[PDB]
Design a protein around this ligand. Sequence first.
Ligand SMILES: Cc1cc(C)nc(N)n1
Length: 167
Amino acid sequence: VNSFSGYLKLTDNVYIKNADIVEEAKKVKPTVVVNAANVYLKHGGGVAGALNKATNNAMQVESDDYIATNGPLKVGGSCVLSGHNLAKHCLHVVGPNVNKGEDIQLLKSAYENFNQHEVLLAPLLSAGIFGADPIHSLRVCVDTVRTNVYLAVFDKNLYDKLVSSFL
Ligand SMILES: Cc1cc(C)nc(N)n1
């Protein structure tokens, strides 16, 4: 049993809810929250900006030190950093950004990072301002992630479309 509440079950291991990932993290304090990161860990706007704002910019400070030491992530890659006030850990995962021309086949590689963690609270990778089709992102998630993933969908309209169209 875990603390996640109000989710619709899509598969054996994938659950979904209409919720802002910042309010859900604050309530649950999951072991892992996933950030929709870029390779520079610049959490300017989007999911990353919303999570970073909720940490009072401490996520950005920690991320700048990570990049100064290690250099940029790969598209499709990830790193584990602190979850600050939101979670034990934040798994920063880089899905391909369609608005930068990145290979959508890298979305499967991005979701494979989730398999290193038994339970996660996550957004749909490459959705929102990363430009991918969220219906596609949910299909890749279900077909790639084998660990238990609790997806937070920010848009009520999009949530209802993801559920209604789910095969
Ligand atoms: C305030 C907010 C929350 C989420 C999940 N994303 C964005 N872009 N902004």
